[model samples]
Target: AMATAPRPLREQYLHFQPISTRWHDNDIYGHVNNVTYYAFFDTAVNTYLIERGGLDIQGGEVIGLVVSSSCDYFAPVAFPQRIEMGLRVARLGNSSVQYELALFLEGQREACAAGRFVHVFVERRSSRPVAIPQELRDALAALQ
Candidate 1:
């Protein structure tokens, strides 16, 4: 059975970056490997956080760790095609945030794939759940 079409892009998906597919991203099937999608998701989120969300990967007291993640493939993407990843905050909890992502080929109206990932804020040293920092919340809210 074919996968369902991806949802429409929201206004919150204002930030976008062009990602070029690598030759190694393809598998024996001649399509982009499924695992590469997860990497792209991570890159998109982290890039947004660092450039706009004030995420300090080195010395921040709080760190966001991926608690849960899942992705659904709707269409195949191969190497040499550029992709645009749309990101938005789906949910913002006290100590966790869910980010929804959609991957689309250049000039396409629908996403080739869609996925959601959850990040739990935790103490860097002890790794215990902690409330998301005010700045982090503000940054994420800006996307909304």
Candidate 2:
């Protein structure tokens, strides 16, 4: 069973992504389904990595594979609500990085959910673990 831990403060995260909650994200219970939170997590992380961090999505030789992910929810978010995702690098290794993320209802200071996502950098063709690119590593360092 997952324990619902206290989420971190909003100021803890270095990057913030504001996203819209779609109607389809809500369940019959009248709140955003639990599984949909993971989608938001991925969307924020990848969008930042690709746009600001210079990660080449289509042809990058070094690719990051999700090694692990987990999250805790403190409240329910409903459709038509605005979401802001917080992102930061908790740990950065030679070929792996653990990202700390938090989801918040727009205008709220406290997080609605919190989680960690780990990525293992690997060779595209061989799928073998490889050292992360220097530029990428440098970019990631800014958030740590």
Candidate 3:
């Protein structure tokens, strides 16, 4: 399937996370590497989960596993700049969720890049699928 246009706007998101770009983020082309955007996405989402959802990454009985993720860039960004990630939940299911995100340079109203990430809740030890916890569900609901 063809990727959609990179057109997600800032208001489409409900929450925001600040990110600092590192010198190593820039590649030889003088722009942030495409792969680094995924890291920003992961950090923004997981930080929200850990802070607001009562998620215990090290000892929780259940954990979320990334099932799928994709990103599309619309503009170039470089190191030594502060960036922000806009986050929202596109879909929330019994044991899985689809998180939509957009990357923006400070003071930008439109997204420089946008993406979707899907995670499935599972048992930590056995890695078996499990229902989303209530607290985590509520926290995620706030983002929708």
Candidate 4:
């Protein structure tokens, strides 16, 4: 991490997913809680894997497990606001991938928050690491 501020722009990402903040997403402070942003990150990544990568959560022999995650806040986003998550692959490996995500207010160019999410592919039953499937690789490449 660098000492300078990280202000990632929307154009830096390859894909964007829209999310609407729910009423309960807000905290007593009247803004979306910091913890809720991780949920948005989780939602966007899995949605992309299923819809674009042909990932079968139930039937597929391989599955992705979240091994690590982190986020940085630049601005406060509140409830009832529609936001967009910018998704991109930061690093792609044989059995793991690091995803860099940014949350932007609707129509905004600069992100309100940004984070890293890492997933390691593994066999569903045995939990042993495996190579990234070809279909999933293609999907991830498109976002690189």
Candidate 5:
């Protein structure tokens, strides 16, 4: 079994988003399915980028492609529960960003789950790696 690592609180996270678990998120084991956590991760990151990073999802010249991702579940969360996703930039590379996320039960101080997703910035049309935008880089730096 994987052991849980220490994680930051919601306030410590540079970004935060609340998500509600759906009935479909539950598995036969009676808790939220592991796969659903990734969906939350995706939603939180994209929401932040679009709302805060100024990403033009429909017409931007650049897009972020998921290059890598990982998660470590500490405690089980069931459907109907509220979760708060906390995010921070772990690394900002030339054309990639590694975002760290923590999922906490609503009102809980410790994370119930934690993970990371690395996004490689690429040209939308060509799908080729592109330098991180100045604006995006600046925003990411603010989290650091």
Candidate 6:
């Protein structure tokens, strides 16, 4: 299977988040390890909810559980080099959302890597998938 190329411009995304590579993020090869990108994706999405969408991580009626995730890299990133994550909603279902994400070097417009994932909203106690609340869905409208 061929690796998909990373594509997507910064301006195309409706939402943006700043990211900084930590020292521990680099692997023995000196590049940011592949797995670390997932963390970046998580922060970009969750932080927005808690700060603006009114999601409560510790105690809330709704929580999003990652159902799937993957990424493709086009370039290497290192510690201290600031990166900005671009985000958009690719699909919005009753109980799930598919987000398209991109990572770009600071001051650059193109992506170094891109990723996508579907997250399911669930009731904290029931652990079963629940529909995304209208207010939360409204907040995500700009990114759709």
Q: Alpha carbon lDDT of residue 31, candidate 3? A: 91
The TM-score of predicted model 2 comes to: 0.94
Q: For residue 104, what is the lDDT in candidate 1?
A: 86
**TM-score, every prediction:** 0.91, 0.94, 0.95, 0.95, 0.91, 0.94
Local accuracy of candidate 4 as per-residue lDDT tens digits, 31-84: 899899999999999999999999999899999999999998888889898999
lDDT of 4 at 37: 91
**Model 2 misses residue 23 by how many Å?**
1.4
Could you give candidate 5's per-residue lDDT for residues 63-139 as a string of tens digits?
99998999988888998999889989989989999998888888888888889999999999999999988888887
**TM-score, cand. 4 vs. native:** 0.95
RMSD of each: 1.8, 1.8, 2.3, 2.3, 1.7, 1.9
Off by over 4 Å in 5: 1-4, 7-12
TM-score of candidate 1 on Cα atoms, chains taken together = 0.91
Error of 1 at 76 (Å): 0.9
How many Å off is the CA of 143 in candidate 5? 2.0
Go through the candidates in order and give each one's C-alpha lDDT.
0.84, 0.89, 0.93, 0.92, 0.86, 0.87
lDDT (Cα, tens digit) per residue for candidate 1, span 8-122: 5534365676789999999998989888999999999889887777889988899999989988888888999889888888888899899988788978767777888999999
Count: clashes, candidate 3: 0
Q: Which lDDT tens digits does candidate 2 get at residues 1-144? A: 234677688999999999899989999989999999999989998888887779998988889899899999888889899999999999999999999999998898988889989999999999999998888888789888
For model 3, the superposed segments whose C-alpha errors exceed 4 Å read 1-6
The digit string of per-residue lDDT tens for model 3 on 86-134 reads 9999999999999999999988897889999999999998999999999
Give candidate 6 misplaced runs (Cα > 4 Å).
1-6
Global CA lDDT computed for model 6: 0.87
Indicate the worst ten consecutive residues by lDDT in candidate 4.
Answer: 1-10
